[PDB]
Ligand binder design. Structure first.
Ligand SMILES: COCC(O)(O)CCCCCNCCCN
Ligand SMILES: [K+]
Ligand SMILES: [K+]
Ligand SMILES: [Zn+2]
Length: 639
């Protein structure tokens, strides 16, 4: 029922600045807030967001994560002169105070709570708060790293008290380790904290031993703190996506959070002087997209770091673009993560193996810098086209339409019939192939339609016309097929990759085919492991121009189909055609709901998969990780 996205911002939070010479602090400028909001207005996305006003966090709310002594000390900063502000800033590590910073800190804290309230009251589906100062370094009785009050820690504690939440996921993709959040929920199993950060073997700020992968929590909360250290600079998009596919996402979907809060620091992007990483701003459009199936889309993005004004504006827009449901941009050049990233990923999975069932099999035997500008993201005129069987009226979302076949398309279906299948008069089939071409032409060519779903009766003839027609308009087509037969699909030229979900196991020889024969109780948990750990890594590296989904009528376990078509829309700018053999009102409504960008129901309590399933999946990884390096979650054995 939730509708749009909130953007909480106020110019007042940019009215404090550093007043003395401090080489460690001069990068935290008010222009980070000005450039970020001005970039959203330039791209027209600010106007597309509901501008929820900011408020001050009350004293009672600040004490949720801070002590009375620390709050009382900061409360007297508005009355201090410059010399007194210098002496107060020296008591903490890499932070400066201003006459207006206590005011702005309460606004940054209150703005975060306004976003949490808007999301939890179903007034919006998600949102972002462009706040300042940041927070994830702030501790109970100390300011730290430009942070006065821990904004994200407030949001989690605030959502727990006023909404009785049991599970909250915090994703910290800032380039620094948010040790203030880790200290706050160190013993709390209700708040799962994930953070990657530039570590360089503790040589990078804040130089903390507990910032390493070994800190998994304490007491009842052990296993709910996940640190992923970067021990070398220059981490690429492949490193960031390997962290998501092989660490964060398997844990997040098993956790099943009721609310997702993001410590969105963009100093992990290309060109930032503090992060020195090499990920392009478009990667944040996917980091946001891969998390939105969680918690029915209830996602609160809180601005943290980001100090390259050009890179910051681009990364903010890519985040809001995905939150508004705009199609995700294509990511090319993906491959294996570097050895340092694979070592970090390998170590985190090993330590966490005793806590999460996605890693449980790893525990015993028999297991001036310049970059190109991002392209223009644009939502289609109508996102989804639905073609039900002849004479079936349906209730469609406001951004959907039905199929009329023009005479230009009607002549093509004939030419296809007089050449191939020249003994085909089933006029019902001829209409479906006419629909397939009409929807595909509106997908690939004109920017009017994003994706679509077509109900078919013949499978071999329909998938042939769909696949062959897509390979001639321009390039690369990924095929996801849930059935047991054999389809006229040739994985010969490297232009097609086929993912097959069947019942009987088939010895696969081509490295362009991924066959998943999953055993029937835990078919939901096993499918999600294969989706996050196998299907998504190869699909992202393959980088298709169109996704072709096929479901035969014999196929049942449909609870996972909504998550697949939502996550798989990260490929091919969301251009996905789904062919459903036979009519199923529930399955058709599920496909159209997820294709349209609506939220998906959580999977609930995710159990543990069968050992025979994880064994089959790891044998597929061994067979394919040499060709598709993004599948790797360990360091390669050198000859
Ligand atoms: C969410 O806050 C944004 C941030 O994480 O980027 C803040 C950390 C800056 C602290 C680093 N000081 C420079 C090192 C010189 N000793
Ligand atoms: K982080
Ligand atoms: K925790
Ligand atoms: Zn940072």
């Amino acid at each position: 029922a939730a509708s749009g996205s909130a953007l909480i911002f106020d110019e007042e939070m940019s009215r404090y600045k550093l007043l003395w010479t401090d080489p460690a602090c001069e990068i935290e400028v008010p222009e980070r807030l000005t450039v970020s909001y001005e970039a959203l207005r330039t791209h027209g996305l600010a106007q597309r967001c509901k501008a929820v006003p900011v408020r001050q966090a009350t004293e009672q709310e600040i004490l949720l994560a801070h002590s009375e002594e620390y709050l009382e000390a900061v409360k007297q900063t508005p009355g201090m002169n410059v010399e007194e502000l210098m002496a107060f800033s020296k008591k903490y590590n890499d932070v400066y105070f201003h006459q207006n910073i206590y005011h702005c800190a309460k606004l940054a804290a209150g703005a975060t709570l306004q976003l949490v309230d808007s999301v939890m009251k179903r007034e919006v589906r998600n949102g972002m708060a462009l706040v300042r100062p940041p927070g994830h370094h702030s501790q109970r009785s100390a300011a730290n790293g430009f942070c006065v009050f821990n904004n994200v820690a407030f949001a989690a504690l605030y959502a727990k008290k006023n909404y009785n939440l049991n599970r909250i996921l915090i994703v910290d993709w800032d380039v620094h380790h948010g040790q203030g959040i880790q200290y706050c929920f160190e013993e709390d199993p209700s708040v799962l904290y994930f953070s990657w950060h530039r570590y360089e073997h503790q040589s990078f700020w804040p130089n903390l031993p507990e910032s390493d992968y070994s800190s998994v929590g304490k007491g009842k909360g052990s296993g709910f703190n996940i640190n992923l250290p970067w021990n070398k600079v220059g981490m690429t998009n492949s490193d960031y996506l390997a962290a998501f596919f092989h660490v964060l996402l398997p844990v997040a979907y098993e956790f099943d959070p009721e609310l997702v809060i993001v410590s969105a620091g963009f100093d992990s992007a290309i060109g930032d002087p503090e992060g020195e990483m090499c990920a392009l701003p478009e990667i944040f459009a996917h980091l946001t997209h891969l998390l939105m199936p969680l918690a029915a889309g209830k996602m609160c993005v809180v601005l943290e770091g980001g100090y390259n004004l050009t890179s910051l504006g681009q990364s903010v827009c890519q985040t809001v673009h995905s939150l508004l449901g705009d199609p995700t941009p294509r990511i090319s050049g993906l491959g294996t993560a570097c050895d340092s990233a694979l070592e970090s990923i390998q170590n985190v999975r090993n330590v966490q193996s005793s806590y999460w069932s996605s890693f449980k099999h790893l525990a015993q035997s028999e297991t001036d810098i310049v970059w190109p500008e991002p392209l223009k993201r644009m939502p289609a005129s109508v996102r989804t086209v639905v073609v039900p069987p002849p004479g079936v009226e349906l209730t469609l979302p406001k951004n959907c339409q039905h199929s009329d076949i023009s005479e230009s398309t009607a002549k093509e279906v004939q030419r296809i019939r007089d050449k191939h299948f020249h003994d085909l008069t089933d006029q019902n089939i001829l209409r479906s192939l006419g629909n397939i071409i009409s929807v595909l032409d509106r997908m690939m060519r004109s920017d009017e339609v994003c994706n679509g779903c077509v109900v078919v009766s013949d499978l071999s003839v329909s998938v042939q016309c769909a696949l062959q027609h897509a390979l001639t308009e321009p390039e690369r087509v990924l095929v996801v097929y849930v059935g047991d037969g054999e389809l006229p699909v040739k994985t010969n030229d490297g232009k097609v990759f086929l993912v097959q979900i069947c019942t009987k196991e088939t010895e696969d020889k081509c490295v362009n085919r991924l066959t998943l024969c999953l055993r029937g109780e835990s078919l939901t948990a096993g499918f999600m492991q294969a989706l996050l750990g196998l299907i998504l890594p190869v699909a992202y590296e393959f980088n298709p121009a169109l996704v072709l989904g096929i479901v035969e009528e014999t196929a049942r376990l449909m609870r996972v189909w909504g998550h697949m078509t939502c996550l798989i829309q990260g490929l091919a700018r969301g251009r996905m055609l789904t062919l459903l053999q036979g009519y199923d009102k529930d399955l058709l409504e599920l496909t159209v709901s997820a294709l349209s960008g609506a939220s998906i129901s959580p999977l609930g309590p995710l159990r543990a998969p069968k050992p025979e399933d994880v064994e089959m999946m790891e044998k597929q990884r061994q067979r394919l990780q040499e060709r598709w390096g993004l599948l790797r979650c360990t360091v390669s054995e050198s000859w």
